[PDB]
Every structure is written in C-alpha cells, then in structure tokens.
Symmetry: C3
Subunit: 40 residues, 3 copies
C-alpha cells in the first residue's frame, strides 16, 4: 500500500471531477475521480 | 472558457447511502460533488 | 483524515463514527502533473 495525506481537495463543476493534491515526493501527484455535481 | 476548480469546505461520507459528499466553495453553499463509495471496517 | 494511494488507486476517508474503525474508500485515478 502507499497511502499519503491529501493536502488540498478541489472539485470542478465543468469537468465533474474532484482533484486531491497529494503530500508526496516532488509535490506533482494528484488523485482525481468522477463525481456528480448538484445543488442540494 | 474553463472554470477553475473550487475548494471543498466539508467532506461527509454517509455509511447509510454509500455516498461521499463534498460541499463546494461556490454560490450559496448548497452545491455539492457526490460520488459512490465502499464503506467497511478496518482490520 | 483523507488519504490516497498510488499503489492501490484508492482514496480513503477515516470516519469518526462508532469505534473509529470505519472507512469510506473509492476508486481513483492517480497521476503526475
Ligand atoms: Zn473546470
Ligand atoms: Zn441555492
Ligand atoms: Zn474527525
Ligand atoms: Zn469495530
């Protein structure tokens, strides 16, 4: 396993992706996943 | 043109519905990103 | 607590609930910018 902290999480209503900036190595890694975006 | 991503102010995962919901820093605070998740006990 | 893993391609959120041993986990893409 290789779990590292997320430093900052953003999401994006025009790509329907959330992006997690990872605390690892040279700082250039992210995790990204697909999401639904809506008003509650 | 492209809209920059917005910060998430609050992340809640609901074990009842198998959804995580990220509250977005946008408009009136009622916008969310939501996705399906697995929920389990560690061990 | 929220962590992500480039080996398993999963992000994991540690939930406060109950005895603190529950997690939410989901599939992700992981890549270098
Ligand atoms: Zn965008
Ligand atoms: Zn509204
Ligand atoms: Zn907590
Ligand atoms: Zn337990």
């Amino acid at each position: 396993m290789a779990p590292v902290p997320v430093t900052k999480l953003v999401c994006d209503g025009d790509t329907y992706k959330c992006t997690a900036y990872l605390d690892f190595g040279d700082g250039r890694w992210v995790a990204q996943w697909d999401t639904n975006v809506f008003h509650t």
